[PDB]
Amino acid sequence: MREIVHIQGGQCGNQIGAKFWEVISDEHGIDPTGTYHGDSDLQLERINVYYNEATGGRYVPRAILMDLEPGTMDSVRAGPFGQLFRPDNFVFGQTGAGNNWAKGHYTEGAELIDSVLDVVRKEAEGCDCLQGFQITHSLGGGTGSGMGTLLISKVREEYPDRIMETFSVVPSPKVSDTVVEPYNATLSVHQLVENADECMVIDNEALYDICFRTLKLTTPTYGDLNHLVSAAMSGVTCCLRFPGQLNSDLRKLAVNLIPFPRLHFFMIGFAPLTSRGSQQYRALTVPELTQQMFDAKNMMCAADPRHGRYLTASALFRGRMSTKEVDEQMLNVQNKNSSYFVEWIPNNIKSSICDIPPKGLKMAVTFVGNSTAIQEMFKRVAEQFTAMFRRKAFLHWYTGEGMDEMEFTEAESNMNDLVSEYQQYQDATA
Amino acid sequence: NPNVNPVFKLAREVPSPIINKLNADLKKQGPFAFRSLSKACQKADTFLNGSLSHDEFKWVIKEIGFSLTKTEFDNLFKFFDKNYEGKVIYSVFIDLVRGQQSEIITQSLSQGYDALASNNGGKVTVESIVQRYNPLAIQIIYPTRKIAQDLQREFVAEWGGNLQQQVNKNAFVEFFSDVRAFCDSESKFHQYFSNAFGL
Amino acid sequence: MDDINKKVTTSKPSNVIFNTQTRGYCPGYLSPHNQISKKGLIVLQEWWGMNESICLLADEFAHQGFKVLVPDLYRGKVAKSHEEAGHLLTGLDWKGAIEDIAHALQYLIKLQGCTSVGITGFCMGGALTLASLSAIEGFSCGSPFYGICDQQTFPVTNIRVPVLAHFGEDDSMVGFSDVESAKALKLKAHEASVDFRLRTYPQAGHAFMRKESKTYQPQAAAAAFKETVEFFQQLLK
Amino acid sequence: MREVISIHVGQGGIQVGNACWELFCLEHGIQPDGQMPSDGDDAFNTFFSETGAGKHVPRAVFLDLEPTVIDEVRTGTYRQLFHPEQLISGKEDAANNFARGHYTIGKEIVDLCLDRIRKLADNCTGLQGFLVFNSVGGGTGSGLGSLLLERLSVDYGKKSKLGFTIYPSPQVSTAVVEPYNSILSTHSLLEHTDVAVMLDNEAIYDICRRNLDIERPTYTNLNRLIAQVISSLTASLRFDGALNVDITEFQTNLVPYPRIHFMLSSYAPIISAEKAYHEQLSVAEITNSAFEPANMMAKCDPRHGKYMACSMMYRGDVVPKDVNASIATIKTKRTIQFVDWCPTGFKVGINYQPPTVVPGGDLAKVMRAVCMISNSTAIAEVFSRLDHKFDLMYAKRAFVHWYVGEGMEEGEFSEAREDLAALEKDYEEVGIET
Amino acid sequence: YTPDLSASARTFHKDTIYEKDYQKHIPELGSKPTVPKDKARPYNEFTKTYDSTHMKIP
Amino acid sequence: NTNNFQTENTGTCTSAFGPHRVIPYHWKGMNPQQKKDIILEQDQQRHEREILKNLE
Amino acid sequence: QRRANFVLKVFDSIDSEQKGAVHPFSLAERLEVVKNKDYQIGSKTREQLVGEYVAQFHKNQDGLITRDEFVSYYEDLGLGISSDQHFIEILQTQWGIKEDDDLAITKEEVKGIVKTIRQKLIQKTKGANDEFLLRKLFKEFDISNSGFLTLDEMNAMLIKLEIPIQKRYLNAVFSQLDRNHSGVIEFEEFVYYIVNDPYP
Ligand SMILES: Nc1nc2c(ncn2[C@@H]2O[C@H](COP(=O)(O)OP(=O)(O)OP(=O)(O)O)[C@@H](O)[C@H]2O)c(=O)[nH]1
Ligand SMILES: Nc1nc2c(ncn2[C@@H]2O[C@H](COP(=O)(O)OP(=O)(O)O)[C@@H](O)[C@H]2O)c(=O)[nH]1
Ligand SMILES: [Mg+2]
């Protein structure tokens, strides 16, 4: 019944996938041994969307884990909830990418993708009616950006009608730890816009920004950042798994957020977020949630949305409330900020309600917004690329596997055209 | 939400400060003030039913010497008469104003009842109590200037005039617990009890 | 929160009863696997009561060539947490339980058609196993697991069948399943001149046979299982 | 999973080999005799190979034409550890002559060494790369080291090779003929070594005196410092961490061009417990002290040139959020500037295992440490100084007759000099704005 | 007034075994090495490359 | 999960008329008990060699 | 001597009365308790039945096994076995006793230790120095000013100069330095050995 499969690649993708499955398992009451522990029958009504059925009454996720170095898969197995994953779904290489886009996309990626493509093909056939694919990878790494984008190309070729969603982490210039990240970032971006139906940008800078100031925890770790992404990842597909006053699936959001097929880069945010010593002090209400939803510093991208115009926006409310709080507030926020919304598409915001809140919360909101202010992070990345490319620095590694400079030239033009297209639609009047 | 408790109310709370003010004021009259409050309720309740009405409770408080205002009565009467029967059980009220008895003190009181009945053969009589006690022990619980000669009359004046009144162990244990409420130290009361009955 | 994965805390529906006359009918679980073997065996529950773990383990024994029956001592009550688990243990009556195993023996021998029957218990079940062997006639052998019953009420001198007991050094219980207590019991049995075998497994804690728990050790469980299965296979006829 | 083969040639290399392997055995819990005392798994396959009987054999081979140095290795407390026939020793030394160690007497020992490497290499199937240590200012060290790299280049090919060479000091040295065999070896390793590391003595001399407060250090103290540098670099292959870097991820992030592959290293914190237990030793403090040119292990001043790329490995209880904060401070600092075409040039690794302290050593037990590998245009300074060495030597053909008589062509000096001049011209060209 | 005592002045050494808090955490010289605890690179699926059957690729 | 083929049982490779003869096609290898004696003889030979050297 | 040290310990394990001779019954009983875990404490004809585990030895007129012959028999048995480890393991698994010295300090590591200490002094201050550095500490605590130095002082002395030597290693170097065997080492002789010695 319109289930989706999960594919995760790279070290960053594996850690996002490792913690994401913990949240879903807790939401549906699945223990680390794969046995149901819940209280209500609603938690089992739509279990087939994420978990397959196995013997003995245990469930296994339909997630494919891929990497070019098996050390990541050894770590993901020894973590909590590590016994749920089926051992056959691990497909790994014994060489590694070495933070090289060319190696992971032409030499090692090409020779290994035959095995993983067989696994994902097998998973898709098992379901009665597939709904789509979701991808979790980082665009700054070697195997995640390199082979991850090639699998998207192959999957799109054989499954045209299905929708594809990507939670992509791009590197920000502030917190930078890889010298060769501008090369493999822009190359993936050109490939991503060609095939991916939906792309969701995530920045480690923004995740650090939220932790230091909002949650006010002194020493955050990568587990904390992975938790924020996992909370947002589960929220977008909540109404497909639970009943509600208003239904909405992944396809419905895509229809109401993509006016033009080349404009499919969104930003996400999660509310509410409170410190430990401030939960006793804040009253949880819909006006409070909506106020934080459009807060600029609440986004998970380095792009500031007040520098552009919201082409479209969507909100997915989780919890029990009346439609008046929802409908009135979205109307109110559009009227008070009419300068931040483009004019030629009136009523450019979508609302959905799901009546199952998360554990420990009475209300929660996941926000997905399409804005032209996202073009500025592409400009900053392209700024660093052209600075390094004119001197042909770190190029002999990229030319060593047959890839030629014309693809480098092609990447610049397509990236610049995407940036220009965002600018054109922002500066338009009826 | 595990992080935050919802407090709120599911049961009517003890009013608090009006009871505390009564307890502090009662300590000023003397060691037998708590006896007077229990004595007043019993003597005002001439019919032995176990409850008092609206006006009767006003008289008992007024008889002791507390001129509580209308609001203070409303708060006190609200908790003790929960569903408005029109009557209030004085036995619960006296227990709360006195405080909490420590199990050690009550057990020592129970043995004191047995010890005083031992010499009499198991029968408790009021002559025995007024025959064997230490009037000079009044000083240790609180200093006083009254002579020991007048202390004997004060002890029996608080007691009944007749010397043939039957006593029960529950009536005996409630007698000394009332005196205990005057002193703030459980140890101080215990060492006074040993001096009085030679135990 | 207790580490309880619904396998030691959830009741397993029974399928077979039997009459004890004094207390009437009491329910029980009969393993559907491997009913062709004439060699019977009785499994006694731990302090929790019947759960999925004890029934699944009982099924594993039946796969090796035995007919396994699990009688009820709690009679429909299953512990849900550690706090009330002790309450049911104290509420249990040893005098009331002793005839239940005897009548289960009478049921297996007559209605099912068994020829020889053994007994096996775990923790308090092993404690009952030692008591059952002394005060009940008709058993062939018993395999208590880290369980010692009261001495004066049920002296071990009355044992008339070979006994094979399993204990670990790493026990933290005092006076119930201590390794030194096991050695003292073995010495008492040997001076009373009754066949008694004591087996000790290195680096094994309490309830080491229980699966899917913090106290599980797989290397010790397999060896003990093999030894007890071979011992039962050899001794039973 | 990751195996690396260690090569030691020359007196300097072997003595460094004693200190690094002593650290390696103690860090993994291996006793000197070679048996583990009775006590993710093992994690020692990187450096040791199990024989099936408990004994562990190091994955290294020792080479020298001088029998003397090998003897106390066999006569020392590590007699039982090393494989008896993997300690290759010759008959007569080169006696500070490159020609002797490359043409005349070095060819009768290379054939045994290649068989030993080949036999040891087939044991592992996930080899990462080779590590070579040699004293460049030595006869057999430069000669055999030069010839081995030539053979390994065609014998194995794409396997990465890292070299911790010992270039002669600027103003003081031991022998007189250092400039000759230094430049000759430089031309050999330029096109055959993937990564070269500067390990000059004067800078290491000054570090020990300034920080450890040792008035009379010796070669033993120097080798221990080099051992800690090697361990921190390799610590990511055998210990988990937040960020993992391997051997093949260094060249991808350190050498913009194949011709320029010379890096100078620094280590922090280097301190004794006298000044350490009085000190907080935070992650920000150690990072700041790492970039001071006075703390560099190469006698060079980075202030005179631009920075090409920077790689740092942290080990201990560091947290990524502070490392990012400390990095921004360096970028804010003005005295350190990067080349124009390098907007970002930092690669950071984090390991949970803190550095291990060796008994009888000088360093103190600390919870944080950083090792630096930096690529800079300032490295051209030391090469120019060696150029000034050779022109004064070669202007009147002094000492050359000791090289012609060994059969070496006289034109080797000319082509070596022109190769060095091109490299110096190359470095200044890469450090110009567009 | 005589000085307090010639044995109570400032002496650079005393008889107090560890004179400074300095020398209490210096690692013991002859001590045997210790194996590291559960802190190492994970090694569970690396086994199926060093088995002697990874060849025979077709 | 039980049985011999899945568990690589080592007790199934014994002959039916000899505790010392073995099934030619069913043999996992030598048990650690047999392996230990080889190491013991290797240890013995080292002391065995020194005795001859002393005589020489 | 290692075999002798082990065999004397094994004999003393059973000879709790220190008579020097052990009745045959206990020796035969021990050889069966370790072998079988189900033998029962007592047997019917246990004396004669278990006496076949013994009497490979010989007994005196009194009927006791003299300690001299018990050691002698294993000495005869210690000819067909040429591995010390094998011999120790055989006796250990035959008698259920495992207690031996871990190792004895060897001259190799003694030389290593004395080299470590000797180099550490050189680093401090200057070359003509460090002899007065060693002497001033002994002047500081040698109250009885007799010039005789003790083992406990050695540990204290080395603690001062940043060399925490292990007690076993300290005993070995202390024992190797002195030939008087009186437990007292002359200070000037120690200084001479540590400093003015041509050989390591
Ligand atoms: N860092 C360091 N360098 C050393 C050490 N020992 C020797 N060297 C260097 O080696 C150079 C001299 O060569 P040696 O190492 O003595 O011997 P060699 O390199 O094998 O050359 P030959 O003497 O001809 O055999 C000196 O200039 C030193 O720089 C050492 O222990 N540490
Ligand atoms: N948000 C997040 N980022 C991560 C995580 N793990 C690694 N990263 C980021 O990913 C970058 C390195 O990517 P890399 O591991 O080389 O990608 P890969 O080559 O595809 O595996 C680092 O800069 C980290 O900031 C994680 O768990 N969460
Ligand atoms: Mg030399």
Question: Exposed, middle or buried by CB within 10 Å (0-12, 13-18, 19+), for B77?
Answer: middle
The two most distant CA atoms of chain D are separated, in Å, by 67
CA B12, B14, B18 angle in degrees (round to 5)?
135
Instruction: Provide the token pair at E11.
Output: 């002496």
D23 and D363 Cβ atoms separated by less than 8 Å:
no
Domain residues for the domain of A362 are 265-374
Cα atoms in the 13 Å half-sphere on the side-chain side of B195: 14
A108 annotated as belonging to a binding site for a ligand: no
DSSP letter string over D276-317? Answer: HTT----HHHHHHHHT-GGGBSSS--GGGS-EEEEEEEEEES
Q: Going by DSSP bridges, is the β-strand pair D368-376/G65-66 parallel, antiparallel, or unpaired?
A: unpaired
Same domain, A117 and A239: yes
The reply to whether residue E46 touches residue A74, judged by beta carbons under 8 angstroms, is: yes
Is the CB of residue A278 less than 8 Å away from at least one CB of chain B? no
Where is the domain boundary, A202, A225, A256?
A256
Residue D249 annotated to the active site:
yes
Closest by CA to G197, choosing from G117, G123, G101, is G117
Where is the domain boundary, A226, A256, A286?
A256
Q: Going by DSSP bridges, is the β-strand pair A59-61/A51-53 parallel, antiparallel, or unpaired?
A: antiparallel
Question: Exposed, middle or buried by CB within 10 Å (0-12, 13-18, 19+), for C119?
Answer: buried
Q: How far is CA A105 from each of CA A98, A145, B111, G180, rounded to the nearest angstrom?
A: 12, 9, 93, 78
Answer whether residue A201 is part of any domain: yes
> What span, in angstroms and rounded, lies between the C-alpha atoms of A240 and D117?
61
Is the CB of residue A83 less than 8 Å away from at least one CB of chain C? no
D150 Cβ contact list (under 8 Å, min separation 6): D188, D192
- The experimental resolution of this structure, in angstroms, equals 3.7
In the reported structure, the alpha carbon of residue D220 is separated from the centroid of ligand 1 by a whole-number distance in angstroms of 13
Answer whether residue A420 is part of any domain: no
Answer whether residue A380 is part of any domain: no
Q: How far is CA D139 from each of CA A86, B157, D136, D405, G72, rounded to the nearest angstrom?
A: 59, 121, 8, 15, 62
Question: Exposed, middle or buried by CB within 10 Å (0-12, 13-18, 19+), for F5?
Answer: exposed
Is the CB of residue G133 less than 8 Å away from at least one CB of chain D? no
Minimal-distance CA residue of chain A relative to E40:
A75
**A358 prior amide bond cis, ω within 30:** no
Q: Going by DSSP bridges, is the β-strand pair C67-71/C142-145 parallel, antiparallel, or unpaired?
A: unpaired
Annotated binding site of D: 11, 66, 135, 139-140, 174, 201, 223
Annotated binding site of D for GTP: 11, 66, 135, 139-140, 174, 201, 223
Calculate helix-pair angle for D412-430, D380-394, nearest 10 degrees: 150
Same domain, A339 and A367: yes
- Atom number of ligand 2 nearest to Cα A148: 20
> In the structure, do chain D and chain A come into contact, i.e. share 3 or more CB pairs under 8 Å?
yes
Where is the domain boundary, A356, A374, A392?
A374
A207 and A300 Cβ atoms separated by less than 8 Å:
yes
D21 and D4 Cβ atoms separated by less than 8 Å:
no
φ, ψ of residue A38 to 5 degrees: the values are: -70, -175
Alpha helices in G18-106 (DSSP H): 24-33, 46-50, 67-77, 84-95
The reply to whether residue G162 touches residue E13, judged by beta carbons under 8 angstroms, is: no
Cα atoms in the 13 Å half-sphere on the side-chain side of D342: 26
Q: How far is CA B186 from each of CA B183, B189, D21, rounded to the nearest angstrom?
A: 8, 5, 74
Closest by CA to A352, choosing from A268, A263, A259, A235, is A235
In the reported structure, the alpha carbon of residue D172 is separated from the centroid of ligand 3 by a whole-number distance in angstroms of 18
Answer whether residue A398 is part of any domain: no
CATH code of the domain containing A289: 3.30.1330.20
Q: Going by DSSP bridges, is the β-strand pair D195-198/C142-145 parallel, antiparallel, or unpaired?
A: unpaired
A191 and A153 Cβ atoms separated by less than 8 Å:
yes
G137, G160, G164: residue with CB nearest E29:
G164
A155 Cβ contact list (under 8 Å, min separation 6): A117, A120, A133, A164
CB crowding A365-399: b at 16 or more within 10 Å, else e: bbbbbbbbbbbbbbebbbebbebbbebebbbebbe
Same domain, A147 and A165: yes
Q: Going by DSSP bridges, is the β-strand pair D307-316/D346-351 parallel, antiparallel, or unpaired?
A: parallel
Same domain, A179 and A208: yes
DSSP letter string over D95-113? Answer: -S-HHIIIIISTHHHHHHH
> What span, in angstroms and rounded, lies between the C-alpha atoms of B178 and B98?
7
Q: How many domains does chain A have?
A: 2
Residue C5: its chain A contacts at CB < 8 A? 31, 33, 35, 37
Residue E35: its chain D contacts at CB < 8 A? 28-29, 36-37, 39
Question: Amino acid identity of A93?
Answer: G
Answer whether residue A389 is part of any domain: no
Q: How far is CA A238 from each of CA A42, A129, A250, rounded to the nearest angstrom?
A: 13, 19, 10
Catalytic residue from among D150, D249, D279, D406: D249
Same domain, A205 and A187: yes
Collect all residues from D whose CB is shorter than 8 A from any CB in G. Answer: 76-77, 79, 214-218, 220-221, 360
Closest by CA to D342, choosing from A388, A173, A183, is A388
3-state secondary structure of E7: coil
| Cα dihedral A280, A286, A289, A295 sign | negative
Match 């925490």 to its residue by tokens: G164
Same domain, A183 and A274: no
A279 and A223 Cβ atoms separated by less than 8 Å:
no
> What span, in angstroms and rounded, lies between the C-alpha atoms of G169 and G110?
8
Answer whether residue A93 is part of any domain: yes
Answer whether residue A174 is part of any domain: yes
Residue E44: its chain A contacts at CB < 8 A? 74, 77-78
Is the CB of residue D421 less than 8 Å away from at least one CB of chain E? no
In the reported structure, the alpha carbon of residue D62 is separated from the centroid of ligand 1 by a whole-number distance in angstroms of 15
The reply to whether residue D341 touches residue A397, judged by beta carbons under 8 angstroms, is: no
> In the structure, do chain E and chain G come into contact, i.e. share 3 or more CB pairs under 8 Å?
yes
A393 and D430 Cβ atoms separated by less than 8 Å:
no
**B143 prior amide bond cis, ω within 30:** no
Answer whether residue A394 is part of any domain: no
Is the CB of residue E22 less than 8 Å away from at least one CB of chain D? yes
Same domain, A368 and A300: yes
List ligand 1's pocket residues with C-beta within 6 A.
Answer: D 10-12, 15, 64, 66, 93-96, 135, 137-141, 166, 168, 173-174, 201, 219, 222-223
3-state secondary structure of A33: coil
> What span, in angstroms and rounded, lies between the C-alpha atoms of A79 and A226?
14
Instruction: Provide the token pair at G74.
Output: 């294993």
Instruction: Provide the token pair at A312.
Output: 């479209």
Same domain, A171 and A138: yes
Per DSSP, what are the bridge partners of residue D160?
A: D129
A144 annotated as belonging to a binding site for a ligand: yes
D76 and D114 Cβ atoms separated by less than 8 Å:
no
Same domain, A218 and A292: no
In the reported structure, the alpha carbon of residue C120 is separated from the centroid of ligand 1 by a whole-number distance in angstroms of 75
Q: Smallest CA–CA separation between C217 and chain A, in Å?
A: 17
A304 and A373 Cβ atoms separated by less than 8 Å:
yes
Residue whose Cα lies nearest atom 18 of ligand 1: it is D138
A297 Cβ contact list (under 8 Å, min separation 6): A209, A210, A213, A214
Same domain, A250 and A349: no
> What span, in angstroms and rounded, lies between the C-alpha atoms of G94 and D208?
58
Closest by CA to D265, choosing from D394, D162, D342, D411, is D162
Collect all residues from A whose CB is shorter than 8 A from any CB in E. Answer: 70-71, 73-75, 77-78, 90, 92, 94
A142 annotated as belonging to a binding site for a ligand: yes
> In the structure, do chain G and chain A come into contact, i.e. share 3 or more CB pairs under 8 Å?
no
Residue G123: its chain D contacts at CB < 8 A? 214-218, 221
CB crowding D35-66: b at 16 or more within 10 Å, else e: ebeeeeeebbbbbbbeeeeebbbbbbbbbbbb
Same domain, A224 and A299: no
Same domain, A206 and A281: no
CA D60 vs. chain centroid, Å, equals 15
List the single best residue of A280, A282, A361, A363 to mutate versus B (max B Cβ within 10 A).
A280
3-state secondary structure of A13: helix
A335 annotated as belonging to a binding site for a ligand: no
| Cα dihedral A363, A366, A371, A376 sign | positive
- End-to-end, the C-alpha distance of chain B in Å comes to 56
> What span, in angstroms and rounded, lies between the C-alpha atoms of A170 and A184?
10
A27 and A234 Cβ atoms separated by less than 8 Å:
yes
* DSSP assigned state of A345: S
Ligand 2 contact via A225 beta carbon (within 6 Å): yes
CATH code of the domain containing A146: 3.40.50.1440
